[PDB]
Short mmCIF file of N, CA and C in Angstrom, two decimals:
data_model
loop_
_atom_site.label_atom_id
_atom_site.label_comp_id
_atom_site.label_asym_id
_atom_site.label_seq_id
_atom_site.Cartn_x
_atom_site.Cartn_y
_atom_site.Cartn_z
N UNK A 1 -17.23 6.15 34.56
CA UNK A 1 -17.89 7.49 34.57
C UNK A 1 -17.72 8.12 35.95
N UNK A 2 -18.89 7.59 36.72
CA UNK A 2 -18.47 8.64 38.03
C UNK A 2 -17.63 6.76 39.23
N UNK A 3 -17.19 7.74 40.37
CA UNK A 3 -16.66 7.39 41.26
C UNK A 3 -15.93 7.75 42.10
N UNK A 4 -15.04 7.19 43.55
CA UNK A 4 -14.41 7.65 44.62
C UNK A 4 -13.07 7.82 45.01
N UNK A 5 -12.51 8.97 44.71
CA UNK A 5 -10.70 8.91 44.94
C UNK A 5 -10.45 8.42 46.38
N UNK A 6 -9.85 7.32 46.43
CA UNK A 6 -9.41 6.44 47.84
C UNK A 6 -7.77 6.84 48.20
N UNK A 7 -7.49 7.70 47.17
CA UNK A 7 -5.47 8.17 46.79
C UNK A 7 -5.01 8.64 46.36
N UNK A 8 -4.15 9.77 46.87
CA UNK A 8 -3.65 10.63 45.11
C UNK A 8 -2.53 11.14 45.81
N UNK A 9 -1.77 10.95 45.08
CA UNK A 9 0.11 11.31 45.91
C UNK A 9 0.28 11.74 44.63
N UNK A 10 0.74 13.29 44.82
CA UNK A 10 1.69 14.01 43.78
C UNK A 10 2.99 13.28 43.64
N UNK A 11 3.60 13.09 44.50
CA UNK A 11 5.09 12.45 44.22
C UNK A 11 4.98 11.64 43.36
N UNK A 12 4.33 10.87 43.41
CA UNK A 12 4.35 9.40 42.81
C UNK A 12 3.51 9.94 41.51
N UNK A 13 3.16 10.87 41.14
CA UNK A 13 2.06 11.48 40.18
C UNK A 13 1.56 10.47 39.61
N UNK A 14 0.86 9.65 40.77
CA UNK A 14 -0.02 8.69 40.21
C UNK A 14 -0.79 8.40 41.54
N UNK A 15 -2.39 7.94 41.51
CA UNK A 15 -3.38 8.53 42.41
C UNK A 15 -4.04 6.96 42.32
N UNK A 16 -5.07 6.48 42.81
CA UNK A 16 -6.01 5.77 42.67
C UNK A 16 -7.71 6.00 43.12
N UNK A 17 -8.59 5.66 42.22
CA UNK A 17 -10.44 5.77 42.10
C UNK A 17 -10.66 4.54 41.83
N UNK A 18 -11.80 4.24 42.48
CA UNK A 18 -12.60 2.98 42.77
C UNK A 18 -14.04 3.37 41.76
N UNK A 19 -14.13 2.90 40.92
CA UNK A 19 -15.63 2.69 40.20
C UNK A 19 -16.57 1.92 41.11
N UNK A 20 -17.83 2.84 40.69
CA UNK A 20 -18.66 2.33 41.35
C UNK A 20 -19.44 0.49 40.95
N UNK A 21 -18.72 0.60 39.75
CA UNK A 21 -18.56 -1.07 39.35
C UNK A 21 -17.75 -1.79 39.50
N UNK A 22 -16.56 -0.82 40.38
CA UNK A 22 -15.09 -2.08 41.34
C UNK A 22 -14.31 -1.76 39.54
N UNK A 23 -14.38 -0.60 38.85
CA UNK A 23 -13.43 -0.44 37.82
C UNK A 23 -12.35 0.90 38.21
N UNK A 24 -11.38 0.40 38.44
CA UNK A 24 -10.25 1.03 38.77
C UNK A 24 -9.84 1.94 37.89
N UNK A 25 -8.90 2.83 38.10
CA UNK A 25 -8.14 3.96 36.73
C UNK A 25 -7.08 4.83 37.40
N UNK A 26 -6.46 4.91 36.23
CA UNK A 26 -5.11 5.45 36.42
C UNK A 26 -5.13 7.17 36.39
N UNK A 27 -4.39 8.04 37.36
CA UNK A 27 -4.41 8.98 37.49
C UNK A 27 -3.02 9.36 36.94
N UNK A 28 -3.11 10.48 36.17
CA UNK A 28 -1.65 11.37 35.53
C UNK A 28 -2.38 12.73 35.31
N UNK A 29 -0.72 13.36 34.74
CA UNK A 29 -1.08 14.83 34.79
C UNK A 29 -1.95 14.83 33.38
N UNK A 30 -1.04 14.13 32.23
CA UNK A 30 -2.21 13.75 30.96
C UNK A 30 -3.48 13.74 31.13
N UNK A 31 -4.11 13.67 31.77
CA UNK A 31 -5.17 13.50 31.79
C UNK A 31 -5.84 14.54 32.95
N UNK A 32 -5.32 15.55 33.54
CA UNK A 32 -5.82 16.57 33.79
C UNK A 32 -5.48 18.14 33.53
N UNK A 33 -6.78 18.34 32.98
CA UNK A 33 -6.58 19.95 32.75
C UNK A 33 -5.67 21.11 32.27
N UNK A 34 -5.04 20.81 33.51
CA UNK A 34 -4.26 21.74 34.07
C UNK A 34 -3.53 21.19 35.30
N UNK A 35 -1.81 21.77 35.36
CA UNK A 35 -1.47 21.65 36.48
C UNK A 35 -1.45 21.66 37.85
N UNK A 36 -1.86 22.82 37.81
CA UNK A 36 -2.27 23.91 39.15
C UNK A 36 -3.64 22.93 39.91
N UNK A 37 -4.45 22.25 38.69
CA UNK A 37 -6.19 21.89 39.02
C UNK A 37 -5.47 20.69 39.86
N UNK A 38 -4.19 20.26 39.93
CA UNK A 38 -3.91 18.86 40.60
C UNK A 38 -4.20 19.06 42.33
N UNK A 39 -3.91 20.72 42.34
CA UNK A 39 -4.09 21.42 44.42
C UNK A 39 -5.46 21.41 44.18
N UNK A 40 -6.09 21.10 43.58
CA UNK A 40 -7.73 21.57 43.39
C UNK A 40 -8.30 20.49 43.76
N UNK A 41 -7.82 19.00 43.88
CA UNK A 41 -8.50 17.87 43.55
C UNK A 41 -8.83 17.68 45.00
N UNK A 42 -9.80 16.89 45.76
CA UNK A 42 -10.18 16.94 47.11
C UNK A 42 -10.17 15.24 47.04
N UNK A 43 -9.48 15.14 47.84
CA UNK A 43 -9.15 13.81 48.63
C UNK A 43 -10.17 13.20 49.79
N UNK A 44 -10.94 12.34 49.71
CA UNK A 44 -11.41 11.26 50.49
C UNK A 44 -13.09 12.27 49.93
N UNK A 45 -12.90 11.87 48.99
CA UNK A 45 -14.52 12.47 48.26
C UNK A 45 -14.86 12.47 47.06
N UNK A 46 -15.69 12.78 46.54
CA UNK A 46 -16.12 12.51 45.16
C UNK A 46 -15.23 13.21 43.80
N UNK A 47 -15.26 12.61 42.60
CA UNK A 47 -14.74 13.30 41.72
C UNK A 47 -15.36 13.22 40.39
N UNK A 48 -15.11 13.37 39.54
CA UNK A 48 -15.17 13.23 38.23
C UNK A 48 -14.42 13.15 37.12
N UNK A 49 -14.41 12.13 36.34
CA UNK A 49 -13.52 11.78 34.94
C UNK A 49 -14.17 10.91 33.71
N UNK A 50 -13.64 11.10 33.02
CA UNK A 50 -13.90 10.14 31.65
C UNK A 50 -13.19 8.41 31.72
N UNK A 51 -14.12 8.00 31.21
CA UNK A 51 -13.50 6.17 30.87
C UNK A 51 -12.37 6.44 29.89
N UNK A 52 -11.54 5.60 29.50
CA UNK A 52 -10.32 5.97 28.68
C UNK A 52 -9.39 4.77 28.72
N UNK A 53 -9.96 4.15 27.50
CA UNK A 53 -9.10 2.53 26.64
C UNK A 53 -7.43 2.59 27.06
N UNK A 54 -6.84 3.14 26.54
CA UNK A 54 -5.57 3.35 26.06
C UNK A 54 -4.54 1.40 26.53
N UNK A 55 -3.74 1.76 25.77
CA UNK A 55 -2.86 0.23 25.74
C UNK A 55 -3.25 -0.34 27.19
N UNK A 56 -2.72 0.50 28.28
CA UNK A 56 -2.69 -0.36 29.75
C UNK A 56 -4.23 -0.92 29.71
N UNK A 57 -5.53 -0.43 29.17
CA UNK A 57 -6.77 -0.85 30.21
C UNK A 57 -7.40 0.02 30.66
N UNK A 58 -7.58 0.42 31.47
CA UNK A 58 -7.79 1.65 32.59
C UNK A 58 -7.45 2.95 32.68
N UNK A 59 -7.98 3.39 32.43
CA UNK A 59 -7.58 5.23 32.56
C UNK A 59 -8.25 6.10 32.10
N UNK A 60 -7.63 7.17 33.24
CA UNK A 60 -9.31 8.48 33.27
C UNK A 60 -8.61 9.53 32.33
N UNK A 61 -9.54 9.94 31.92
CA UNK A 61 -9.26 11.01 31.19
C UNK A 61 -10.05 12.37 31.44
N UNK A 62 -9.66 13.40 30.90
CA UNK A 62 -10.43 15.02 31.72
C UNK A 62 -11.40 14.80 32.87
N UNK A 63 -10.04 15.33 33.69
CA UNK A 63 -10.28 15.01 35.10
C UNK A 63 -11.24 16.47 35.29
N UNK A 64 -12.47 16.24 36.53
CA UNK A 64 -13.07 17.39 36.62
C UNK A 64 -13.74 17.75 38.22
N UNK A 65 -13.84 18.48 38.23
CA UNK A 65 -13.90 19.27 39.92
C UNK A 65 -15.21 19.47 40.07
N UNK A 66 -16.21 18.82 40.32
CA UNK A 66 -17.54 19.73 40.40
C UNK A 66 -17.96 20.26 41.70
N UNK A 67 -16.83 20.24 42.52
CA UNK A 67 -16.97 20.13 44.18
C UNK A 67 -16.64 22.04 44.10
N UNK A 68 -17.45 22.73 45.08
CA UNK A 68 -17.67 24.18 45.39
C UNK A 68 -16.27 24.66 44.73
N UNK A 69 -16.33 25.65 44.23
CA UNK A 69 -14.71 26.39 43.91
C UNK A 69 -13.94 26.88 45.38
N UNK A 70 -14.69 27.68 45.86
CA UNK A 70 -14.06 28.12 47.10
C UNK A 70 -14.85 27.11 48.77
N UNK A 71 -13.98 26.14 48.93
CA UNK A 71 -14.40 25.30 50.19
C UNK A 71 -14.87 26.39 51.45
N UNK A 72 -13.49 27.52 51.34
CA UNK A 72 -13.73 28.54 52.37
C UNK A 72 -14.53 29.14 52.37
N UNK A 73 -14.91 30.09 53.57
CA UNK A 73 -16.01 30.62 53.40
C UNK A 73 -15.64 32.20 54.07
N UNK A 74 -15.81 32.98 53.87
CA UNK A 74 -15.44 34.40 54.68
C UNK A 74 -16.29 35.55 54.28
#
């Protein structure tokens, strides 16, 4: 459910989150949104996603932003 992105490299379009029960999950574009929401995601801070079975084990599903829309401020 909830937990901490420790990684997320577009290149590799694959990221890593630490559960707060030490349960790991796999990051893809499948499983978020939208493309564009991938510049949206904030690194070394909180996030949000769904638990998600699939063959491998591990994996998040609808990835979600609840962090301010605009960081900036003007």
């Amino acid at each position: 459910m909830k937990g901490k992105v420790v990684s997320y490299l577009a290149a590799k379009k694959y990221g890593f989150i630490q559960g707060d029960d030490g349960e790991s999950y796999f990051l893809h574009f499948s499983e978020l949104l939208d493309k564009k929401d991938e510049g949206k995601l904030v690194k070394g801070s909180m996030v949000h996603f769904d638990p998600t079975p699939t063959p491998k084990g591990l994996a998040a599903k609808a990835i979600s932003l609840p962090l301010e829309h605009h960081h900036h401020h003007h």
